[PDB]
Chains A and B, each alone.
With several copies, the nearest count.
Chain A
């Protein structure tokens, strides 16, 4: 009753959140100096870290 089981889903979600906080920091560092009407919201994010 004091021991909980985590399946593949919960651990995959944990890893996905670990990647999401990193790409959030990335887009925060990118948006801190970005101006208006220069790009579409595609280069702000990256796919290699996740």
Chain B
């Protein structure tokens, strides 16, 4: 079962970290074990009124929790790409992901 594991990374370039993680998936055709990135930094203000239009299209913590059924080779893959500061979770280093109710919560956050 492709669970939704949460991971923290080198912030700032978090979107580019997600794209590099995707490139590393598609390199070793890891889409069998893996899913997508779910970076729902999608608070979508567009107040493009007078005197200012630069609206903050992005708002979400720097977590890029990825759907995947975890394997130790998969863990060392997601750690092999740079900018993976913390693969968080209660464990030595092999964690348990967030439950499905928070999957519904992140669906709400995406839709909003």
Contact = CB atoms under 8 A, between A and B. Distances in A.
Nearest to A25: B82
| Contact residues of B: prevailing secondary structure | helix
Interface of B: 19-20, 23, 82
A40 interface: no
Interface residues of A, number: 4
Contacts of A32: 20, 23
Nearest to A32: B23
A29 interface: yes
Contacts of B19: 33
Nearest to B83: A29
7 closest cross-chain pairs (CB), A and B: A32-B23, A33-B23, A29-B20, A32-B20, A33-B19, A25-B82, A29-B82
Contacts of A29: 20, 82
Interface string A28-39: 010011000000
Contacts of B82: 25, 29
